[PDB]
């Protein structure tokens, strides 16, 4: 599913991501824009041979099982395919674990490089939340 900007902001809010670990809803929408372009089906291979899955490009190295990432963990206890569903519940649940791991949203390099310190509230502008 390709989410609308406000459509995804509403879904992330409903799933409790707004100000989770202190990150405003705009930070999450901005991360999802630059990780996936709001596409739940987005997959990208990393150089280390792990893969990033779904709207928040969650990495098979640590968080989900894809059965092709040697020496990797599955800390969200989910198949990586569950991160590609039109229902973002699994992605959000797993993202809560990632952002709680100690480095906050710096875990998302695209967040650090493209959202951090920017006017992230712009990403929820015009949205009826
Ligand atoms: Na894994």
UniProtKB/Swiss-Prot annotation:
Start and end residues of each C-type lysozyme domain: 1-129
Cellular component aspect of the GO annotation: cytoplasm; endoplasmic reticulum; extracellular space
Cross-referenced InterPro entries: Glyco_hydro_22 (IPR001916), Glyco_hydro_22_CS (IPR019799), Glyco_hydro_22_lys (IPR000974), Lysozyme-like_dom_sf (IPR023346)
Catalytic activity entry: Hydrolysis of (1->4)-beta-linkages between N-acetylmuramic acid and N-acetyl-D-glucosamine residues in a peptidoglycan and between N-acetyl-D-glucosamine residues in chitodextrins
Uppermost EC category: hydrolase
Cell compartments where the protein resides: Secreted
Keywords on record: Allergen, Antimicrobial, Bacteriolytic enzyme, Disulfide bond, Glycosidase, Hydrolase, Secreted, Signal
Disulfide cysteine pairs (residue numbers): 6-127, 30-115, 64-80, 76-94
Binding positions (substrate): 101
One of the record's GO molecular function terms: identical protein binding
Keyword check for Hydrolase: yes
Enzyme Commission numbers on file: 3.2.1.17
PROSITE patterns linked: GLYCOSYL_HYDROL_F22_1 (PS00128), GLYCOSYL_HYDROL_F22_2 (PS51348)
Active site per UniProt: 35, 52
GO biological process, one term: killing of cells of another organism
PANTHER family in the cross-refs: LYSOZYME C
Other comment: Lysozyme C is capable of both hydrolysis and transglycosylation; it also shows a slight esterase activity. It acts rapidly on both peptide-substituted and unsubstituted peptidoglycan, and slowly on chitin oligosaccharides.
Protein task: Lysozymes have primarily a bacteriolytic function; those in tissues and body fluids are associated with the monocyte-macrophage system and enhance the activity of immunoagents. Has bacteriolytic activity against M.luteus.
Protein name: Lysozyme C
């Amino acid at each position: 599913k390709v989410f609308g900007r406000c459509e995804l902001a509403a879904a992330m809010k409903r799933h409790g991501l707004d100000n989770y670990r202190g990150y405003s809803l705009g930070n999450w929408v901005c991360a999802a824009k630059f990780e996936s372009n709001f596409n739940t089906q987005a997959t990208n291979r990393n150089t280390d041979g792990s893969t990033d899955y779904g709207i928040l490009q969650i990495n098979s190295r640590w968080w989900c099982n894809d059965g092709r990432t040697p020496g990797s963990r599955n800390l969200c206890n989910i198949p990586c395919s569950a991160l590609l569903s039109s229902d973002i519940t699994a992605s959000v649940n797993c993202a809560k674990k990632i952002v709680s791991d100690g480095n906050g949203m710096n875990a998302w390099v695209a967040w650090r490089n493209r959202c951090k310190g920017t006017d992230v509230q712009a990403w929820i502008r015009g949205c009826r939340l």
